[PDB]
Every structure is written in C-alpha cells, then in structure tokens.
Amino acid sequence: ATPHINAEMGDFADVVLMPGDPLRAKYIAETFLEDAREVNNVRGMLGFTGTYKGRKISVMGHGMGIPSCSIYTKELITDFGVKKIIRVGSCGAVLPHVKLRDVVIGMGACTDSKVNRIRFKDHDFAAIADFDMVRNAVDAAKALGIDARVGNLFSADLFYSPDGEMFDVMEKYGILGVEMEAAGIYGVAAEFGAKALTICTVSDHIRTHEQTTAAERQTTFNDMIKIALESVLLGDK
Amino acid sequence: ATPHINAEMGDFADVVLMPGDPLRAKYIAETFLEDAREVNNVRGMLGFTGTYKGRKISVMGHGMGIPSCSIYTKELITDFGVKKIIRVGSCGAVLPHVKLRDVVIGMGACTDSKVNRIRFKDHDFAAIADFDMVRNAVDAAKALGIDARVGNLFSADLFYSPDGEMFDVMEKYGILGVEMEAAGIYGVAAEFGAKALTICTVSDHIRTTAAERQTTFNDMIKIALESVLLGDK
Amino acid sequence: ATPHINAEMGDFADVVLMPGDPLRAKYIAETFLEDAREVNNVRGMLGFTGTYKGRKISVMGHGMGIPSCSIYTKELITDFGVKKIIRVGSCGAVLPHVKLRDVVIGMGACTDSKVNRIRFKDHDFAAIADFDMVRNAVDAAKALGIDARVGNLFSADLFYSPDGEMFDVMEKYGILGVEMEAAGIYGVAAEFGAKALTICTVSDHITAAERQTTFNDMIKIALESVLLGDK
Amino acid sequence: ATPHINAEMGDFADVVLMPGDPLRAKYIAETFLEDAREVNNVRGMLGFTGTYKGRKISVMGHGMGIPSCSIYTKELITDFGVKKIIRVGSCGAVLPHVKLRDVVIGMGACTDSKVNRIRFKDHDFAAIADFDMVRNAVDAAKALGIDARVGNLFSADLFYSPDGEMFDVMEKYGILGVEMEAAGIYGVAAEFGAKALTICTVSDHIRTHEQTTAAERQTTFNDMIKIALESVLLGDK
Amino acid sequence: ATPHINAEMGDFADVVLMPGDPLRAKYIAETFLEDAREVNNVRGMLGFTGTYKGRKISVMGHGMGIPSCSIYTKELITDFGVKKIIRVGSCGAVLPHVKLRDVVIGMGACTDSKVNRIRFKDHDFAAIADFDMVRNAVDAAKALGIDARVGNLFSADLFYSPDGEMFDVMEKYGILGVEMEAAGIYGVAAEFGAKALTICTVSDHITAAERQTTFNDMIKIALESVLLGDK
Amino acid sequence: ATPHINAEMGDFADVVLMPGDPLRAKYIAETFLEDAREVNNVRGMLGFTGTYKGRKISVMGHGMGIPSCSIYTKELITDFGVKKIIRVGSCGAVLPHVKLRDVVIGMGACTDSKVNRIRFKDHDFAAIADFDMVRNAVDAAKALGIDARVGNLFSADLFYSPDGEMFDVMEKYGILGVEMEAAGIYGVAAEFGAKALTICTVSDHIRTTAAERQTTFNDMIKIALESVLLGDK
Ligand SMILES: Nc1ncnc2c1ccn2[C@@H]1O[C@H](CO)[C@@H](O)[C@H]1O
Ligand SMILES: Nc1ncnc2c1ccn2[C@@H]1O[C@H](CO)[C@@H](O)[C@H]1O
Ligand SMILES: Nc1ncnc2c1ccn2[C@@H]1O[C@H](CO)[C@@H](O)[C@H]1O
Ligand SMILES: Nc1ncnc2c1ccn2[C@@H]1O[C@H](CO)[C@@H](O)[C@H]1O
Ligand SMILES: Nc1ncnc2c1ccn2[C@@H]1O[C@H](CO)[C@@H](O)[C@H]1O
Ligand SMILES: Nc1ncnc2c1ccn2[C@@H]1O[C@H](CO)[C@@H](O)[C@H]1O
C-alpha cells in the first residue's frame, strides 16, 4: 500500500492503461477486461486488474494535471512492479486538419510545466515516449484499420490559459493535441526507469467545438483503447 | 454546463469548501450539511450543496495538484457565480515548532510551478489569500478555542521531489506547511476576481491516533464553516 | 556597530518604523516620539529612538530600492535585536478606484527583483507581511476612523520601467499600489526570522493635505498598531 | 545562391546527409555516391550531389554547433527544395554500457541551448525526429545486421563543459550520446516545415577513451552512412 | 524639476560625479570644486555644481543599490542634459592579488539584478562603460602616478548574499571588485544614450590612508579624466 | 594533439587571428604573413603560422557560431599556449549612424546564448575584451589613419532569427554590430585566463563595390596585426 494506492505487490499487472478519468477506467475494465477486479479506490481513483485475451492487464485513472499523474505513475513503478504505462486520454486540437475523435500518438510532449526543468538542471529535457511502444501502437492501428497521427503533444498546466497567443506557437510547430500530463508521465518514466506512451483522442478543438463528459468516458475513445490493448500484445512478442 | 462539472447556475452556493479528496467532500456534506444534495460527479469529483446553520453552502473536491484545482475553481468562479473558495486539506510540516495536527492558515503560498509567472510576465506574483477570509478563520478558530498558525504554505508540483534540497530552504524561510494547490487557487482568485483561502492540518513532519487526527480535521472544517458565518455579517 | 549603522546593541527598540526618505525619520522623531535621541548618521541615514505612549520605538530611513532597504533591515534584525519592521511610505496606484491619499497595507508584495529567487532556488517565494501586524494596522486605522485597503503591492526595481505594459498586468491582478521595497523587506524578514509590514499612502496614479493629514495619519496608524500588537 | 551556399535550385537532392565535418562529407561523396558532383564550397563547407543505387542524393557538412547547422539546414530547406535531412555525426557516450563506434539513433534531443526557448515562448519544446524516418533507420539497421539504440541525445553548446555534474544528470535520464546540433536541426526542421533525423557514432566516452580525427572522417562511421542511405530508400517506398 | 531632483535645466553640468554616500558629494564640492553652489536636497541627496580648472562639474550622490542610482541617473540624462556620469565609490575584492586601496575601473559590470534582462528581452546585455572614459581615467591615474586595474565588476543586489559560493565564481572569472550599482548605471546610459564610468577603491577583501589619499586620489583621477576627455 | 587541431605545442604563435572562414585564414596568411606554414586542417579548419614584420603570428578559422569558436579558442589557450585571441570578421549594423565598411571594435558583446549563464550561475556575466588589446587596436587604427568605433556587439545564436523584434531592442541600447561569436570567445578568455578581442567590418545594414569592401577588410587585418605589435612593447 502506497500513500495514494491501497494495494499490494501483484494486484497490478506489469502493464497498466491510464486515463485521467477514473470513471473511464471503470468503463474500460467493464467493457474490455475479463474477470475485472477493483484493486484501488483511495481518493476515488479507481484501479482495475483483469485480462484481455489471456493477457493480464490493469487500468487505473491518474487524475488531471502533471502533479497528479506524477504521484500515481511513481507509486505504481516503484511499489507495484509496473513496467509499462500507456496513458489513454483526450486532448484539444489546434491544427485545422485535426478532427474530433481523431486518434493521436505522442512520441514527444512539450510542456509549460517546470517539472522537467527541476530534474534536468533548468535545461531542455526532451520528454519522449518509448520507441517500441510507439511503434507497437502504430502497428496496432494499421491492423485495426484506425487512423493515427504520430507527433508532439503539449502538456499544459492551465486548461484555461491566460496566454492564447501560445496556441499560434503550438500550431506553428504543429503540436497534434493539447492535453495535461503526457510530459509529466514521460519525465517520471525516465526518472524511475520505466517505459511509457501517451495515446489521445481529440475531444475538442481549441479553435472550434467540443464533446460531452459522457461521450468522453464511454463513447468511441474505444479506438485508442483497442489500439492500446492490442499494441501491448504486440509488445509481448 | 462545463466538461468537468455537470451542474447549472444555481446548483452551488456562493461559497464552496474544497478538499482534495472527492470522498472527503461527501464526508463533509454528510457530516456537517443538512438537506445536502449531490450537484456533480463527472470525473468522480463529487460536489454537494446543502445548508450549515441555515446558510447555503457547497462542498466539492478539487483533486491533487494546481493544474487540477485550477480547472474547478476557475469554472466555479466564472460559471457558477461562486464568490469564495475555501480549500480544506492537509500538509507536511518542515519547521520543528510546528507539530502534528496543527491547523495552518495560508495567508500566502510559495510554489515551484510556472503557472503564476506565465500569468505575471515571468515576474514574482505573491499568491495571497483574501484578508477578511483569513481573519474570519482566525476569529472562528479562537471561538472554537483552537489556536491557529498563519503564514506561508509551499505548493509543490512534485509530491515526490527529486530536489530533496528544497525542504531545508522552505524551513529556512519558515514556511508552515507543504501542500499542492494553494498557489494555484490564489492565482485563479486573482485572475478572475474572486476570494479564496486554504486551511490545512499538519498530517506529517519531515522529522498520534486516528481519533485525535479525525478530531482536528473536523475542527478545521468547523473553523471553515464558522468563518463563512462571521464574514456573512 | 555594523557596516551601515554606527550603533550598539540596545540603541534601537525591538520595533522600527522606516520611511524611504531619511529626512522623514527626523520629522517623525520630533512630531510623534518622546525623549528621542539620535542613534545613527553613517550616510545621512538618520535613526532615532524614543517612546510613544510609553512604548519604546525607533525611526530610521531605508533609502530607495530593495538593495538599500535590504542592507539596513538585515543589520537591524541580526545585529540590533530588532523584531518588527514597519515600512511607512508612498506608492502609485494603477487601479481605477484606488484614489489619491488612500492608505494601503501590503499583505503581500509582488516584484520584478531577482532577490528572492536567489534566496528561494529560483522558485516562487510569497513575500508576505506578518498577519498580526496587518490586522493591527487595519484595526489601528479603523479606530482612527480611516478605511485602509489590504492587498498586494508591487515592489518595482525600475522607477522608470522600459515597458509600461506591465501596469496593465498589475491592474489585472489587482495590485493596490506600486512602490519599491516591500518585497525586499519581507524577504529579509523571512530569511532572518522577524516580522515586517508595509503601509503606503497613494501619492499618485502611476501640501497640507499630504503632510498634516495622510502622511501623519499613516504614522499614527503605524505607531498605534504597534501598541495593539503589544496586546 | 544563399548567403552561405553558392548553388541553384536543383543542385541538391530532396534528401541530403549532413555530417558536421566537411571532409567526412567529401569522403561520403567519394565512397558511397556515384557521379558525385561538388555543388558547394563557400566557407569550405563542401556540398556534394550524386546517386546511391539510382537514388539521387546529396551530402554536405553543417559545421560544429547548433547556430552553424541552423544556418545551413535553413538555407537548404527554404532555398534548395530539400525535404528530409539526416545528420550523420559523432558523439560522446555517458552511459557505462555504451561503446565506441556504437550507432545511436536520436528520436529526441535534449539541449542546453536557448534556441528552442526563443522560438517556443520560453517553454519546453520537445525536439523530436520524424517518426517514419526514425523507423526507416531502425529497419535499415536490422537489414544490415548492425546494432543501434534509439533514444534521446543531448545537444550541448560547450564541448568543454564548465559543469561536469550535468553528465550525472544526463546519464541518470539515460541520454545515449552527447553531440552538438541535433536539437537545433530538429528545431529548424519544425520551424521551416521539413523532416529530419540524427544518427550518430559514439566517437568517445566522456568517462573514458576516444578516437582520432582521421578515424572520425573515414574509418567505420560507414555503418551509420549505410544505415542512413538505405533507410532513405526505404522511405521512398 | 523631476520627481527626485528639485532643479531646472542648466543647473547641472554635462558631467556628473556620483558617490554612493550623499555626505561625500558635499565633501567633494568643498575640497575639489570651485564656486560651488547647491542645486538639490530633495531627500538629503545633496547635489553641487562648480568648476575644476575652469571646467564646469557637478557632484551628487546616488544612494545604495541599482534601483536607487537608476532613478537619479535617468532623471539627470533625460531631464538635465547630462551626458557623462562617473561613479566614484568603494568595493570589496575577491581576487588574491587585488589589494586594499587599489583603484579599479569597471570596463564592464556583471550583476545578479534582473534589471537589464527586463530591458534586453531576458537576454545577455553586456553592461559596459564608455571606452574613452575608461582610457581617460586610466591615463589620468598614470599621470597621477597611480596604477589602476581595468576589468570587470560585479554589481550585487544583496550586500548580504544568502549564498557565498558565488564569490568563488567571481574569482574564477576574475572580477576586480564587488560593488552595487555599476551595471545599473551602465544600463541606464545605454537606454538613454549617454556615457558612464565606474571607478572604485578597494575598501576590503569581501582613516587618513583612506581619505586624504585613496579616496582623494580617486576623485582626482575622475576629475582629471574629464579634462582629458574634453581633449 | 586534440580532436579538432592536429598540431603540437609550438606550432602556433602566442597570438592568433581568427576569421570565421577557413578560406579567409589562408587568405590572411597568404596576404600578410611571410614564411607561413599550414599548422592544421582536421575539419577543413585551416590554421597557419608565419611572421608579420619579424613577429611570429598565427591565423586560423573558428567556424560560425559560439559553440564552434569555443572549441578552438579553448584548445588554443589550454593546449597550444596561446595568450591572445583576435577575432577578425564581419557584422550587420543596426544603428543609422553606423555605415557600411565601418570598423567596429567590440569592447563588450551581448548575446542570446545560455553559454555564459551556464558558467556564471545563471547571473549576468559581462563578456568584455581585454582593455589593452582594445586600446592597441584603437591606436593602431589611428596610425593607419582609419577611425574606429568601440562598443557593444551582439552575438546571435540564430542568424535567421524568428524573433525579428530584437533588432529594435539592439538599436535601442545602441549595439554597434551583430555577429555570432564575440560573447563565446570572451567567455572562454575569462574562463581559462587568456586575452581576446574581436574586430569587425560592417558587411550589411538592417536598413558599395568589392574593391572598397576588400580594402576595408585588409585595413581591419592591418589594424589587427599592428595592434599586436603595439602591445609587444
Ligand atoms: N482542450 C484541452 N486543453 C487541455 N487539456 C485537455 C483539453 C481537452 C482534453 N484535455 C485533457 O482532459 C483533461 C482536462 O479536460 C486533462 O487531463 C487533459 O489531458
Ligand atoms: N507532505 C506533503 N507534501 C505534499 N502534499 C501533501 C503533503 C501532506 C499532505 N499533502 C496534501 O495531500 C495531497 C497529496 O497527497 C495534496 O493535495 C496535498 O495538499
Ligand atoms: N508611483 C511610484 N512608483 C514607484 N515608487 C513610488 C511611487 C510613488 C511613490 N514611490 C516610493 O518612492 C520611492 C521612489 O520614488 C520608492 O522608495 C517608493 O517607495
Ligand atoms: N564528447 C563530445 N561532446 C560534444 N560533442 C561531441 C563529442 C564527441 C563528438 N561530438 C560531436 O563532434 C563535434 C565536436 O567534436 C560536434 O559537432 C559534436 O556533434
Ligand atoms: N564589499 C562590498 N560589497 C558590496 N558593496 C560594497 C562593498 C564595499 C563597498 N561597497 C559599496 O558600498 C555600498 C554598500 O555598502 C554600495 O553602494 C557599494 O558601492
Ligand atoms: N547580419 C549578420 N548577422 C549575423 N552574423 C553576421 C551578420 C553579418 C556578418 N555576420 C558574421 O558572418 C557569419 C555568419 O554569416 C558569422 O560568423 C558572423 O560573425
């Protein structure tokens, strides 16, 4: 049992999918895993462990923001023997050709957080995913006949940014989606020696329209889940 | 109304207490509020509204971290007409004279996030609470016969800090407690013109029983609710 | 004796009022203190000690800028046993409804100085006053029939800022008045463990009505807050 | 003709390999390309264009440092129609299990340069390579039976760093090699809309021994070149 | 008249010597100038104007800290037609062979102030003196049989630095002396287009031998450098 | 001896002129030096050593950029006993009174690289030239009857700046010329205890014939070589 996770070594698989929303986690456990067993609930952060095609998998929420998922990802890696982390979240689009429900794979993640600067002597640490994991996810996609753009995400500390001019900068450098934890998860993965990948579904467009919470914890967003789960199986081989 | 709260203008009071744990919010509503009804739960972030001694009040969790509590408090201010935000959580102590179970009141909050530099042209913004609100809590604490420290809190971005060095720094400049959102909430308050205050009970020390721990948590909440009554006058 | 204060332990009271102008420390000693006696003159920075309603108090200027007030404040706290520092000065207002002559208590002080980042490992240190001192000042003003504003101040390093766009930012976050030392004094107070407070009278929006009035009111507010503090 | 390149549209291929050393470039043109024709020499920065198995390719040096290769890569992209840039350089190893002549592929590149901060409003821009290009290079390697680690590189402004404690930080976050321009090339690629990849051969070990300039412009360092050239052909398909 | 200088165009010479100590501006007017006349007293910051070997010159203190000297310097340049500013002060030495009483001309000034970054879009602005003024000062000292050291200075914002490890860094890069304003003055000079120079006498390694000597020597060096400048 | 210079202690003079272009170094050696022999070329970075009016002197290119000239100048100081480094290049002008072909002397150099903050604990280090060296060049320029401006240079990391805004800033604070290495070389000089100076001729302006351009380049070099003679005394 860690400060935020009441579980023991073994309750979790070596691989756990992590959405920011705990209710999406329950939905994942219920819709895709077999013999799903709840292993955590300390602050409502639901944790589940079951099997997808024989493969033992776990799925748990990490909350919103980099300092939130940093806590969870860290405890999972250091105290529950977890090896790979695949964040299954949502994000806002800034590029004109990016559509809602489009799946994005972040091989990299920019950020306006100071976390990585704190652990890299105020320099620029490129927050990147695990190449193979990224590739497992690309292959999985092609095999499921689902589209997916591979690129940089931007992990923001402020959902409601006081600086909108930064979206022109993001767009210029073509960041695929705006979310809030990828860059923190990668930094943690690296700091504690683990492997991770962030997959996201465009839930809204910074320049246009959006979805609903309901749609966000159950509708589609099944594509990224299928992709995530299948890519894991690819990694097993 | 918003993607993180499925309530509508009128569902929340103009004063909202905010613990980090969604489960603690249900606990507060259940323990101190009468005729309380759940007003939200889109991400498990339970929110409630009821009345404390005839006063309409709300209680909702903000999750761990500045980025998280920034989304909720911001939405509460601009979308649900909330005027005051009172965070009620816990913190770790760094100074020796500060003991377990102490009720700390953050008049100001230092932080290691770039959130406020981003909104303050990279300069130093002093994230402070609302004066009267701090005072209402101090007075309310005296009435409940419970002494309370007032000072600086440190809002950390990393609960598991790689830079263990900051603790000696924090102690050097005498920050009372260490938590993870005071500076974030104060920043929102300043930006959208609202009032906020965060009270904490010392849960640990860098250097007691549950019945005693739980008694102090309830005191913090009583001080919170009672301060709101004082300000009403 | 210290590099900038030619005096010995005991010469200063545990409480010191500090105007920016050295010429005003003398005025205060003559106008409000009793049995005053000069205790410093090192650089024309006149310091005095006397009593107010029996309470021992000292007065001495700190000069303009954080670096300046920082030298004096530190030396007083670490070498003259001083425990409280009340800065009494002026400031410019940026907000639409903060008027000339108003009184503002700086509960906190924003700054463009790199002084606290150097102290706080380049992190955000909330330079704040001592709450009790804030409340005392607030209570002192109410008794004097004055309505003080309690909020944030902006301690600027450049009186003549290269960019005036920052004044909008300041309004946006409701800073009450623009001055040049509050954040420096608070920084020193936190570093050497002592209590500090800054009270300012709006002298412009970025005579008798000033002196025998507002300025005098602010000094009365300060001195009376000390007594309340002693309670 | 650009300020630093005396050539015209067409003299260069859409793909050009770029080592920091102009003499290594001549060596590449001479050893691997056919009908090699010199297209530049303004400040000794030799430029060559020929063919590798029918494919028209160019190879030119970019000098040492981020501000140097920034000039060249920029002019190439904006004035000579270049689309893909593959840096073929050398680097120092900081990890104990990294050996001289080991080939490294940088999917990411950390840096202590301020360049990306200047173009990203003082935030953290993840300097990453083009995924497909990275994968072309991985596949090429497996096909040539050559080993290659994929990861983060660190682009340094100071070869002789006044801060050696930063190597512990680099090593901790497992950066594969220390070089001096990857992060600048990626930033330019993104700022001007082009695709790029950085391949490096460990020329020395920060904690141990090193090679010679001669070995650096001709010996081995053929592996990365073969990998680079072949991966391009893969990308053509 | 300006916020901190109660005078009108014409009251100051196009050249102004500036000690940190206001009390020393008066000493210089009496000891070296001729037909001096007070031109300011706003905050005890005494300013004087007279002539040296027929050359019109003014003397006035700037106070401690960059913020301080920055207010005066700017007002002099933009409102009183001043074209040259020579700072004459003291500093502490960190280098092993820079001795007490030595004279150092700051060709450049390092700083921990955020003042120029605010001016230079957070980039590195080389706060430098006017070369001619440096050379004039250097030539002036040689004639006076004095061997001045020309190099870098470090303008510190905190007299009492929270970390003393920086003093090693300073030695490593050979800074000649530690003071508190040179980089601020240079910044203002560059911003409003004017020439500035800082001359310091080593007063410590971080009496008659000081006054009627070193301090007097430095003032002689300064005044004579002006005349050479006029050539 | 080193991975960027294949010479040995004795191959270089204690004073080295450094243009950015390796080809320009060969041009200087060929045009002003007698009995000059090539002392290096590992990356095409030609280096030469000969004598100017009986004085032993070297000329070697440093490539474009601070990171590049930092490697060479550093190696020259610590590995080949070099005492003085005199960069001789070109720059762009930003101020109107500064005309094409002006010979600028950088007494100081502003920069936008983190190189010096890295070595100066993130504080402001004033990258300046050696005083006497600046003076020797000023005197030598008068003798050659050529006026010369002395002031600040700006060492840019990005020749193609995305932030076009800096030019007005540079002009505001009156920096004479814009190049790419002065601050880098000065930083090395300070760090390894050596002396350096960079002279530039204005090649362009942000707002003439080759024979005239080439005449001014030679003047710069003559001023460089002649300044070295003055200092020798
Ligand atoms: N437009 C946006 N800006 C910022 N974050 C966004 C979006 C859209 C989705 N998310 C992600 O969902 C949570 C906050 O809504 C966060 O956990 C975040 O990853
Ligand atoms: N010692 C500590 N360091 C950091 N955060 C701490 C503590 C102690 C309590 N908290 C609070 O609890 C939540 C994260 O555990 C956070 O919401 C935070 O307020
Ligand atoms: N409008 C303003 N901007 C900046 N400082 C101001 C004002 C008004 C008053 N002060 C105070 O006076 C000194 C500098 O003039 C400073 O010490 C400061 O306390
Ligand atoms: N140990 C090291 N530290 C820094 N750069 C290194 C090495 C080793 C090789 N390189 C690369 O080669 C050039 C400088 O030697 C540069 O262009 C650089 O990419
Ligand atoms: N050792 C030191 N450290 C810092 N400042 C010093 C010295 C020595 C002299 N000064 C000068 O005196 C004023 C501050 O004491 C400042 O204005 C400064 O010019
Ligand atoms: N306008 C400019 N901006 C930047 N660098 C410039 C110029 C003009 C000349 N230089 C110098 O030439 C080289 C890069 O072209 C560099 O080595 C540099 O010294």
Side chain identity, residue E222: A
Biggest CA-to-CA distance, chain C: 48
Element (H, E) at C58: strand C55-60
Verify whether ligand 6 is closer than 6 Å to residue F178 (CB atom).
yes
- C-alpha angle C52/C54/C59, rounded to 5°? 35
SS3 content of chain A, % helix, strand, coil (to 5): 35, 30, 40
Side chain identity, residue F47: G
CATH no. for residue F5?
3.40.50.1580
Give the DSSP per-residue string, F34-60: EEEEEEE-TTS--EEEEEETTEEEEEE
Residue A234, classified by CB atoms within 10 Å of its CB into exposed (0-12), middle (13-18) or buried (19+), is middle
Residues of B with a catalytic annotation lie at: 204
Whether the Cβ atoms of residue E102 and residue E151 lie closer than 8 Å to each other: no
Task: Pick the residue from chain F with its C-alpha nearest to E112.
Answer: F123
Tell me the C-alpha distance between B144 and B224, whole Å.
11
Q: Are strands D195-205 and D103-111 parallel, antiparallel or unpaired?
A: antiparallel
Phi first, then psi: what are they for C103, rounded to 5°? -110, 130
Tell me the C-alpha distance between E176 and E158, whole Å.
18
Tell me the C-alpha distance between C40 and C60, whole Å.
8
Query: Going by CA atoms, what residue is nearest to atom 9 of ligand 2?
Result: B91
How far is the centre of ligand 1, averaged over its atoms, from the C-alpha of A202 (Å)?
Answer: 9
Q: Are strands E149-155 and E103-111 parallel, antiparallel or unpaired?
A: parallel
Tell me the C-alpha distance between E115 and E101, whole Å.
30
Radius of gyration for chain B, computed over Cα atoms and rounded to the nearest angstrom: 17
Tell me the C-alpha distance between A175 and D210, whole Å.
39
Tell me the C-alpha distance between C187 and C85, whole Å.
12
Tell me the C-alpha distance between C82 and B216, whole Å.
35
Tell me the C-alpha distance between E154 and E93, whole Å.
10
Q: Based on the structure, what is the number of domains in chain C?
A: 1
Nearest to B161 by CA among B170, B172, B148, B149: B170
Sign (positive/negative) of CA torsion E110, E113, E114, E116? negative
Sign (positive/negative) of CA torsion A86, A91, A95, A98? positive
3-state secondary structure of B201: strand
Question: Do D128 and A131 lie within an 8 Å CB cutoff?
Answer: no
User: What's the token pair of residue E83?
Assistant: 């074209």
Verify whether ligand 4 is closer than 6 Å to residue D111 (CB atom).
no
Tell me the C-alpha distance between A39 and D128, whole Å.
37
Task: Please count the other Cβ atoms lying within 10 Å of the Cβ belonging to residue F223.
Answer: 27
D90 dihedral zone (left: phi>0; alpha: psi -120 to 50; beta): beta
| Number of residues assigned to chain E | 231
| Number of residues assigned to chain A | 237
Give the DSSP per-residue string, A24-58: HHHHHHHHH-EEEEEEE-TTS--EEEEEETTEEEE
A218 dihedral zone (left: phi>0; alpha: psi -120 to 50; beta): alpha
Task: Please count the other Cβ atoms lying within 10 Å of the Cβ belonging to residue A1.
Answer: 12
Tell me the C-alpha distance between F177 and B74, whole Å.
48
Structural domain of residue B34, as residue ranges? Answer: 1-233
| Number of residues assigned to chain F | 233
Tell me the C-alpha distance between A181 and A109, whole Å.
9
Side chain identity, residue C44: G
Tell me the C-alpha distance between E110 and D225, whole Å.
46
* Residue C141: partners with Cβ closer than 8 Å, 6 or more residues away: C103, C147, C148, C221
Dihedral angle over CA of C113, C118, C120, C126, nearest 10: -10
From chain D, the residues in CB contact with F70 under 8 A are 157-160
Residue E54, classified by CB atoms within 10 Å of its CB into exposed (0-12), middle (13-18) or buried (19+), is exposed
Whether the Cβ atoms of residue E134 and residue E225 lie closer than 8 Å to each other: no
Tell me the C-alpha distance between A7 and A13, whole Å.
12
SS in 3 state form for D196-211? Answer: EEEEEEEEEECCCCEC
Tell me the C-alpha distance between E110 and F127, whole Å.
9
Whether the Cβ atoms of residue C157 and residue E67 lie closer than 8 Å to each other: yes
Tell me the C-alpha distance between B58 and B72, whole Å.
13
Q: Which long-range contacts (CB under 8 A, 24 or more apart) does A99-102 make?
A: A99/A202, A99/A205, A100/A202, A100/A203, A100/A204, A100/A205, A100/A209, A100/A210, A100/A211, A101/A201, A101/A202, A101/A220, A101/A221, A101/A223, A102/A147, A102/A149, A102/A201, A102/A202
3-state secondary structure of F165: coil
User: What's the token pair of residue C14?
Assistant: 């545990």
Nearest to B72 by CA among B109, B106, B45, B91: B45
Residue-wise burial string across C37-58, b where 16 or more C-beta atoms lie within 10 A, e elsewhere = eebbebbbbbbbbbebeebbbb
User: What's the token pair of residue E156?
Assistant: 């510190």
Q: How far is D113 from chain A (nearest CA, A)?
A: 8
C-alpha distance across the termini of chain D, in Å: 31
Tell me which of E90, E110, E166, E205 to substitute to probe ligand 5's pocket, judged by most ligand atoms within 8 Å of the beta carbon.
Answer: E90
Q: Is A165 annotated as a binding residue?
A: no
Task: Please count the other Cβ atoms lying within 10 Å of the Cβ belonging to residue B228.
Answer: 23
* Residue B51: partners with Cβ closer than 8 Å, 6 or more residues away: B33, B34, B35, B36, B57
Q: Best of A95, A125, A139 to disrupt the D interface by mutation (most D CBs within 10 Å)?
A: A125
Selecting among C112, C204, C217, C230, the annotated active-site residue is: C204
- C-alpha angle B146/B150/B152, rounded to 5°? 145
Resolution (A): 2.5
Nearest CB to E126: which of F110, F150, F165? Answer: F110
Tell me the C-alpha distance between A187 and C165, whole Å.
36
From chain C, the residues in CB contact with E112 under 8 A are 114, 118
Element (H, E) at E110: strand E103-111
- C-alpha angle F79/F80/F84, rounded to 5°? 110
3-state secondary structure of F31: helix
Read off the DSSP letter of residue D159: S
Tell me the C-alpha distance between F221 and F202, whole Å.
14
Residue B208, classified by CB atoms within 10 Å of its CB into exposed (0-12), middle (13-18) or buried (19+), is exposed
Question: Do E172 and F150 lie within an 8 Å CB cutoff?
Answer: no
Tell me the C-alpha distance between B204 and B179, whole Å.
11
Half-sphere exposure at residue B172, Cβ-oriented, CA atoms within 13 angstroms = 15
Residue with tokens 């009793």: C34
Task: Please count the other Cβ atoms lying within 10 Å of the Cβ belonging to residue F204.
Answer: 13
Tell me the C-alpha distance between F47 and F59, whole Å.
6
* Residue D156: partners with Cβ closer than 8 Å, 6 or more residues away: D111, D112, D113, D178, D179, D180, F67
Tell me the C-alpha distance between C223 and C204, whole Å.
24
> Is D204 a residue of the active site?
yes
Nearest to E79 by CA among E185, E182, E192, E190: E192
Integer CA distances (angstroms), C119 to C82, D206, F9, in order: 21, 33, 46
Verify whether ligand 6 is closer than 6 Å to residue F184 (CB atom).
no
Radius of gyration for chain E, computed over Cα atoms and rounded to the nearest angstrom: 16
User: What's the token pair of residue B52?
Assistant: 């404390």
Task: Please count the other Cβ atoms lying within 10 Å of the Cβ belonging to residue B100.
Answer: 14
Experimental method: X-ray
Whether the Cβ atoms of residue E8 and residue E14 lie closer than 8 Å to each other: no
Tell me the C-alpha distance between D59 and D62, whole Å.
10
Tell me the C-alpha distance between F34 and F54, whole Å.
9
F179 dihedral zone (left: phi>0; alpha: psi -120 to 50; beta): beta
Residue-wise burial string across F28-38, b where 16 or more C-beta atoms lie within 10 A, e elsewhere = bbeebbeebeb
Q: Annotated binding site: which residue ranges of F?
A: 4, 20, 24, 43, 87-90, 179-181, 203-204
Element (H, E) at C31: helix C22-31
Residue with tokens 């993104």: D190
Give the DSSP per-residue string, D30-90: HHH-EEEEEEE-TTS--EEEEEETTEEEEEE---SSHHHHHHHHHHHHHHS---EEEEEEE
Whether there are 3 or more C-beta pairs closer than 8 Å between F and D is yes
Tell me the C-alpha distance between F196 and F89, whole Å.
14
Tell me the C-alpha distance between F87 and C138, whole Å.
64
Verify whether ligand 3 is closer than 6 Å to residue C112 (CB atom).
no
